[PDB]
Write a new protein. Sequence first.
Lengths: 32, 491, 116, 389, 52, 56
Amino acid sequence: YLASLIRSVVALHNLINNKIANRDAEKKEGQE
Amino acid sequence: GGGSTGEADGKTAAAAAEHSQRELDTVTLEDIKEHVKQLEKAVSGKEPRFVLRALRMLPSTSRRLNHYVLYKAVQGFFTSNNATRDFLLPFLEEPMDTEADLQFRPRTGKAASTPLLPEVEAYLQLLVVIFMMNSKRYKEAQKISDDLMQKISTQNRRALDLVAAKCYYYHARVYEFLDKLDVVRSFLHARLRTATLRHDADGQATLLNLLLRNYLHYSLYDQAEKLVSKSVFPEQANNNEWARYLYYTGRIKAIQLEYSEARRTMTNALRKAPQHTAVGFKQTVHKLLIVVELLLGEIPDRLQFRQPSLKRSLMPYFLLTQAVRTGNLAKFNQVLDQFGEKFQADGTYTLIIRLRHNVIKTGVRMISLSYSRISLADIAQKLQLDSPEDAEFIVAKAIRDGVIEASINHEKGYVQSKEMIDIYSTREPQLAFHQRISFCLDIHNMSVKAMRFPPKSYNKDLESAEERREREQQDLEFAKEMAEDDDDSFP
Amino acid sequence: YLMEGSYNKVFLAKGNIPAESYTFFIDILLDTIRDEIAGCIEKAYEKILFTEATRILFFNTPKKMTDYAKKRGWVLGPNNYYSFASQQQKPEDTTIPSTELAKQVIEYARQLEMIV
Amino acid sequence: MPLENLEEEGLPKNPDLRIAQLRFLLSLPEHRGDAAVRDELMAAVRDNNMAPYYEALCKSLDWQIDVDLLNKMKKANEDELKRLDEELEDAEKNLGESEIRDAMMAKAEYLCRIGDKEGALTAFRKTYDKTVALGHRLDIVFYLLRIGLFYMDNDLITRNTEKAKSLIEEGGDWDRRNRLKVYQGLYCVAIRDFKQAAELFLDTVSTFTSYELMDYKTFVTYTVYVSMIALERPDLREKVIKGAEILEVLHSLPAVRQYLFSLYECRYSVFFQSLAVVEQEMKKDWLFAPHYRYYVREMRIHAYSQLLESYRSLTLGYMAEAFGVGVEFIDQELSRFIAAGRLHCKIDKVNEIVETNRPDSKNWQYQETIKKGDLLLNRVQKLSRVINM
Amino acid sequence: DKKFHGILDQGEGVLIIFDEPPVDKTYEAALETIQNMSKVVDSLYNKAKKLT
Amino acid sequence: EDDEFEEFPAEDWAGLDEDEDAHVWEDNWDDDNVEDDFSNQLRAELEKHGYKMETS
């Protein structure tokens, strides 16, 4: 239980990292 | 008149609503010119449609208009030949155009006989319906507006189905004041089965929702049950739609004596309604969740009653729980007596009266865990039951339903507990964990499986780029090769 | 009263007389009521006197109660004696789990090894 | 000279805690109205009392808004708000940082001794961005930590507690690290917690140097009050009853000596007979912790636990005379706490024997785990909704 | 004072001394890491509110 | 596609009744069953049943 739980939290934080990198890539995809 | 509201609110508070009116025109020039056109332009009905989701927040800001002074000339920019412009103008109170002109010519009026003109026709007429009902008109301007829109969506192509989602939604809403016409039930039906063969998930779901709402506003629960079962709710659907469906299917599971599934659907529902706001929807799903847990045999958590605005609507329930958790019939009768009138404000009162089973289930399973043996004469006194005759039957029932694990000696008059398990010889804890980690783990395959998309936009960016760097290196390995034949000094 | 076993429901089947058509039909239910009552009492007690069993299942005679103490299979000593069928043989065997829990463990492994 | 150190060596009284907090809780008209309150408030009229947070005291509490009084304090208010900003303006032609800082601080300090929460918050936050010295930085972080206690806002306290520990390590200046413990403990004990609160409070009784918050006899009172809640048997035998400050100060207060020693001597009549008097006296009437039921309901658990951990079997007839009460009283209480799984025994009202049992160990864990865990799975559930969206 | 884990009995005078095993740490710890992980989740919530 | 709700009534308020505030409180369902009844419950039970005169 504990193991799988930590695993989940960590993977999810990974996902937050992807979303934020995507927003900041969307500010670059515009520009010129 | 200067100095009063005949000029401070007659031309200066009207002129500001004219600046906002004339800004809204510029906004629907981006909702229609850029985005409704983009639907067919190069995506065939995709992301430019979710920019027409904006049709939610635009009625609140349609108070910048009065189905405005510039409108007669605005629906006439959008088209050349139209019989909706010939209904829409009858239903305007008074257009009195000014010297403003939207970006349309006699050339952008010829070019607007488009398959995008049904999207605009419905899109704007929807606005006519919104205001028509706000101002408390209905009857002719209701029906006619709607039915012309029901002739619009009869047309072909798969992009109009989506905007027809919103169409249907308002259609039912206005149809629902005067008297929720069951006539529409057939239209919905007919348009639903059609949508199942066109495989328009969106329209299929939305429509299916307003249908379920029809069966539920009356007492046709059996008719919704057999339906919910026999039919397949689409896979792609906007979340709002999925929250509706998960509140209704749960309502149904609840009434037919199945609190099991309900408490698990109910909850998923609460957690899909939009976060920041959703006031009413959340405010009601609570009034039901709170009772499905009680009915199920579990206490609801306290945080459901410590919430900003919707704490004023739950206050009666709070005193239902005061009585249910404690375990005695007396307080349950008193509380469901004072506030019964309000519980009868919805169709919940049918579920509530059932709790008399559970206040005694808990009162008695509580006595079992408080005591080791006690006399029936006292069991009747703590439970506010009937006789010592009634008690023995009640307890007995509990036993046969493995909800108390005890025994009775009747020739002496006492119930006796057999409790002496240390929970760990049970599987129980291992079953509970087998539950936890399946849930938990599912979140871990799931959120990587959706994390997949951010990496995909980057792969859309080159990952073989800087070929001139590699070619420069290759031109350095021909100078390096011979640099080492010249450090060897050997041919 | 029916859903949550409470009795005094056989008594109220002749007191619901305000509409006579109720008392004509409800008589049917009274053969299920006796069955659920004896279903619990088979577990709830272990020694009662015979005349009390006649007062609980709502019989007036001793004869009826002999027949119904014969279908459930009880003996007729001075007090009507029960047979232990509540938890006659306990679930003291996790050998019966054995295979099933091993399936489960394997399953977890599948979710931690799959390519997602 | 009077006991060497007495009523000195304190932080300034600008946020004017407790007197200006307590006057507000006891300014509710269901337990006190009268002039006993009004007097307290008049002291806050003498320190200029023009803040729309004073109009919003006369507004929420429905005290009467006398316009004749408020315009004299508005006049004073304005006179020193112009005098101070002129001190500042003339201080941007004299020295640099060295002299500007103390003008800006004289301003921020005065927007809150007159009780204007927001203007004050920005003057403090504007002087902190103008850093220079470690000790000062700390001082104006304690200002926010007092003010953040006197309007009782939690975000405002958290960020400053954790921003304080950092500046406490950069200097290591220990004596501050004490008073950070009294603040952080006060806050630890507003919200429930007691555990951590009892470590904090109890480990600095010897180094109480704070005022503003308490007098000192007060502080001792709270320490006892919590230590009998979180600490268990011979943890409290050593830390409390055989200590230093504790015995000396308790010695001049039956309101704690008689409440403490009794729980330890197992004189369970004295214990209840006091516990009432301590509920009313100080729980309800001071800004301890508006869960005045939670502390008692907990205390009765603790006690019934003592007189039931030593005896395989003892009858209600022995407790009724041992707590001074009667059989009904105990019956209700004990049955409700056993239903809550707080005691670990059970009763049978044929003989009136109170048999115990010895499960404990893991049986209490797991129980606990699943509790906390499902809470966690829920917050991560919701989170995954905000992330996938 | 917890010095030998027993239970005195009055009415028969038997000083019962049940033997008690130690509370395993594999739980106490996991109580502490679940505890901690919450804090993480909260701060992670504030990181969530910024990007979107 | 939808994004709105407007099919259920709501209640919005600024007159809000009070309960136990929750910030990290344990929020136990036990503390709403009492009313600080505890001083009262002693006095009245020591006089009524005489266990302040008969019984110490």
